[PDB]
């Protein structure tokens, strides 16, 4: 484990890796908006199917 | 004899002066890669 750790290791702070998370978070918000507003049209449109019927 | 070693003393001095040269430029690649993974880590971060 540990030499696996050690030859897959670069050189650089650590704290920087971990602010990677922002980025990633920002990345997948707007994925997640599209998802819901995909849920949304969807739900809409089911309650128009319901309101027809 | 004496007269024939200094050509060999000389040729292994000879070479090792450019082994010391391929440190160098072996060196400035790993400073060179080493850079690279600090960007690559900076984006993986």
Avoid at chain 1, 5 to 17: A, E, G, H, V, W
Avoid at chain 2, 9 to 29: G, L, N, Q, V
Wanted: no cysteine; aromatic share 10%.
């Amino acid at each position: 484990d540990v030499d696996t750790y050690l030859s897959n290791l670069q050189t650089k702070t650590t704290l920087s890796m971990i602010a990677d998370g922002l980025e990633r978070s920002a990345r997948d918000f707007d994925a997640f908006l599209e998802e819901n507003v995909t849920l949304e049209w969807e739900a809409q449109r089911k309650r128009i199917y319901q309101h027809f019927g | 004899s004496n007269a024939d070693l200094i050509s060999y003393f000389s040729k292994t001095a000879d070479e090792m002066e450019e082994m010391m040269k391929k440190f160098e430029k072996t060196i400035t690649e790993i400073e060179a890669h080493l850079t690279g993974v600090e960007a690559h880590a900076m984006a993986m971060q």
